[PDB]
Structures are given as C-alpha cells and as structure tokens.
Design a protein around this ligand. Structure first.
Ligand SMILES: [Mg+2]
Length: 269
C-alpha cells in the first residue's frame, strides 16, 4: 500500500540546472491527491528556498527542511530543532579555528553568513538559503540556530568530516549533502527523523513510504522507507542502501518513480 512519497531535491527531484518538469509533476500530483497519497519534500536546504520550488502547492504538501531541523505539515510549522547558546558558541568557535573554511549558520528566521565571506561563496549559498543575512559576528545572532553548512573542495570532505566528528565530540554530526557540501546537524535530527514526525502525525507507517534520494544525508531516509530509490547519479553507499533505482536527475528520475506508483509498475505491480 503506498500512502506517502518523499523526495530529495538537489541531485534528485531537480536536474543539474535546478529545474523540473512542472506540467508533468502537477498532473501526477493531482492524481496522487485524488488517491490520497501525500507528497513530502525532504532536503537540507532552507524552508524558504524549498517553497520557492512549489509556489502553487506550498500549503498543500509537507516539508522536511534543514535535514529534519524544520518540519512543516500542510502549511503549518510542526517542529524545529535548537542548539543551546553554549552548544552553538562551541560549534562556531571550532569552525572559526579554520580561517579557510566558509560556512553559514542556519536559523529559524533566517540563515546568516559573515559579512566578510567571499562573494562567490555568498552567491552560491544564496541558491540554497533564500533568507541569508550578512552579520558582523556569528556569536551575536538573535535567532534559534539548528544547523551549519559548509562548502569546500569535495575531495576534502572525508578529512573534514573525520576531524569535525572528533572536535565537536558529537555535539553536532557532520554529513554530506552532495558534491562539495557538508552539513553539521543535531544528532538524530536527520531526514528520517523528520519524516517519522509526519507519519506519527498521520498515523502512517514506513511500510507505506516511498523515498527517493542521491546523497549521504539521505541514508537514514532510504533505510527507513519500504520503497527506497537511489537516483541513477546517486553516491555509491546510497545505491547500496536503496532497494530500488531509477534514472538520473537530468532524465526525470524522480518523476518516473512517481509514475511507477501511479501505473503500478515494478516494484509496485
Ligand atoms: Mg541531494
């Protein structure tokens, strides 16, 4: 029985150019709604950036933003994570020890970046955080913080992750959201956790869930879902975790999974 379809955005639902087939998806969505199947967007991007992709459906569908740190259901904020003042001060201090590491502080009202960060970095992060405010001091932000995002040479991700895993003693866990992206999240607050909040809400089970993804921060989501799909362009460990597969993001791979649910083809026959 399928009752929920959850999809990642970057490298998944979106093609390399960050667009999707809107008319095709809109028709699929209307049939899903008709069958009473819920649609969920699960991404590490900011809530405000995520809804920019679904302006005409933003209050109907549900969102697991910031990797599960911010969850909306039918247009209403359901939950948000939070780092204590001390925790965030410690994480920021550790990040700052590396004057070569560029990062953004993700909060409930907005994301923040040093007013001294490189222009290319800010322009790049602006594509993932539509609410991004320059700040003089990361330590003086009046908002609830619940995640940090770094951009760095992709080939350096394993070192940094290992290093950060120890230097923060688990206060926050380093995870990869795709090429050149590293997210620091509150332990346990991943996409799978956010999705479960919705399932609990709807009295549904992981057995009724279809999930589609392509990178490290999708691991728990795919392991939890009965119908797990790895995009054709997915990372190796993700292809291994996922039970099923589909075309890559430049060939409507996510929409094809939705189509299989609607037409009952493998694995939904
Ligand atoms: Mg992705």
């Amino acid at each position: 029985a399928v009752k929920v379809i959850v999809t990642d955005m970057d490298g998944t639902f979106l093609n390399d150019a960050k667009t999707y087939n809107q008319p095709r998806f809109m028709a699929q969505y209307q049939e899903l709604k008709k069958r009473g199947i819920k649609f969920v967007v699960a991404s590490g991007n900011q809530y405000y950036q995520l809804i920019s992709f679904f302006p005409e459906l933003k209050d109907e569908i549900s969102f697991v933003a910031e990797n599960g740190a911010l969850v909306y259901e039918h247009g209403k904020q359901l939950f948000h994570g939070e780092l204590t003042r001390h925790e965030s001060r410690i994480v920021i201090g550790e990040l700052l020890k590396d004057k070569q590491l560029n990062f953004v502080a993700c909060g409930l009202q907005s994301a923040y970046v040093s007013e001294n960060a490189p222009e290319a970095f800010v322009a790049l992060m602006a594509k993932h955080y539509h609410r991004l405010k320059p700040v003089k001091d990361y330590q003086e932000i009046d908002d609830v913080l619940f995640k940090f995002s770094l951009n760095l040479p992709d080939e350096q991700i394993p070192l940094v992750i290992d290093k950060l895993h120890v230097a923060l003693d688990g206060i926050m866990k380093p995870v990869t959201s795709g090429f050149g992206f590293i997210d620091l999240i509150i332990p346990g607050l991943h996409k799978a956790n956010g999705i479960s909040r919705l399932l609990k809400r709807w009295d549904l089970s992981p057995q009724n869930v279809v999930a589609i993804g392509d990178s490290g921060n999708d691991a728990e989501m795919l392991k939890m879902a009965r119908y797990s799909f790895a995009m054709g362009n997915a990372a190796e460990n993700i292809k291994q975790i996922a039970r099923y597969a589909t075309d890559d993001n430049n060939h409507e791979g996510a929409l094809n999974v939705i189509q299989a649910v609607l037409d009952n083809t493998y694995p939904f026959n």
